[PDB]
Ligand binder design. Structure first.
Ligand SMILES: NC(=[NH2+])NCCC[C@H](N)C(=O)O
Ligand code: NA
Ligand code: NA
Length: 347
């Protein structure tokens, strides 16, 4: 049962969201009274309540989304509020829809997106994973964090080949090590107010750490937002080598530690934006001609299901759910190939 103290905070939060007439989060949009009354008295098997989902969007009213998952069960148990937010954010992933089974596909159909070297500065493929049996960061204990780091660092120690590298615990990290990792853009810090209000940064820095291979083309963040954030990257556009490295790595990890995955949602993540494939495939790319009209540059990316962010821009696949890991990477690749064709043919 939910304790009366949590029920009281929940009721105060619900009212606070209705009184913020100018607040525009997805949480506020879909947390109406009936959805709230459906959910407020539920509790997962690991002890997570609705407050462990919505507290950050109650405390930060400028949140774009405003909800996080405190454990894997919370996605199903609290479906009445998660499902409409997931649908909205992922642009048509309905409550009755289903994400495909995992498929990394035929890696040999993946190509270098810019053999010319003229346009793509670097290419990157990011994924995320939760480890089966562990709550998510809102509900992990100090002992969980410690035990998880022990198991994860043990696995990283077995990496050989191009994956062989070093684990750096944040606990007891010295300032020279930190500066070394900042220079590599490999360091993460305590979360901002959105994560703080979500109870994601408790017992910092216990259980948090960084791994990277000697080549500095592979990086893992442990307990930064998800249990594991796994990135493969390098200069140039060799998406084939990059993606295959990521897959080798994820498969190696999985062989020792099972992941949390849902038949409807795919891979379960702390934020609902990272569900499904979890894949974020991107290039840092300069398109001088196409970009001299940023509205049309954004329009062009938008036609290939791409998102432009921060001369050199980050262009990535917008879609995470409803498509396989292969299809997601292939969509970035085909979109980038086309935009380069356009840039090369533009006057
Ligand atoms: N982990 C993330 N990037 N989540 C996306 C949303 C972040 C923040 N809670 C917001 O809703 O604005
Ligand atoms: Na989306
Ligand atoms: Na193409």
């Amino acid at each position: 049962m939910v304790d009366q103290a949590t029920l009281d905070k929940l009721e105060a939060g619900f009212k606070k969201l209705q009184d913020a007439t100018d607040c525009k989060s997805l949480l506020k949009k879909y947390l109406n009274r009936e959805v709230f009354d459906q959910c407020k008295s539920l509790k997962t098997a690991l002890g997570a309540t609705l407050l462990d989902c919505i507290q950050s969007g109650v405390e930060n009213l400028d949140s774009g989304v405003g909800i996080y998952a405190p454990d894997a069960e919370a996605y199903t148990l609290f479906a009445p509020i998660f499902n409409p937010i997931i649908e909205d954010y992922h642009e048509g992933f309905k409550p009755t829809d289903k994400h495909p089974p995992t498929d990394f596909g035929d890696i040999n159909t993946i190509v270098n997106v810019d053999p010319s070297g003229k346009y793509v500065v670097s290419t990157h493929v990011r994924c995320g994973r939760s480890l089966k049996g562990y709550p998510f960061n809102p509900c992990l204990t100090e002992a969980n964090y410690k035990e998880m780091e022990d198991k994860v660092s043990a696995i990283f120690g077995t990496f050989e080949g191009e994956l062989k590298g070093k684990y750096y615990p944040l606990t007891g990290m010295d300032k020279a090590t930190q500066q070394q990792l900042i220079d590599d853009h490999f360091l993460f810090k305590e979360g901002d107010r959105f994560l703080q209000a979500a109870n994601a940064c408790r017992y910092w820095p216990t259980g948090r750490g960084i791994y990277h291979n000697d080549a500095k083309t592979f990086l893992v963040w442990v307990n930064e937002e998800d249990h594991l954030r796994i990135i493969s990257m390098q200069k140039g556009g060799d998406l084939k080598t990059i993606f295959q490295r990521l897959v080798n790595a994820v498969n190696t990890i999985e062989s020792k530690l099972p992941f949390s995955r849902d038949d409807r949602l795919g891979f379960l993540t702390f934020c609902p934006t990272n569900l499904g494939t979890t894949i974020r495939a991107s290039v840092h790319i300069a398109l001088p001609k196409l970009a001299k009209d940023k509205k049309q540059l954004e329009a062009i990316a938008a036609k290939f299901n791409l998102q432009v962010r921060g001369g050199v821009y980050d262009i990535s696949n917008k879609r995470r759910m409803g498509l396989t890991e292969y299809q997601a990477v292939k969509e970035m690749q085909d979109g980038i190939l086309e935009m380069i064709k356009m840039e090369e043919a533009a006057p």
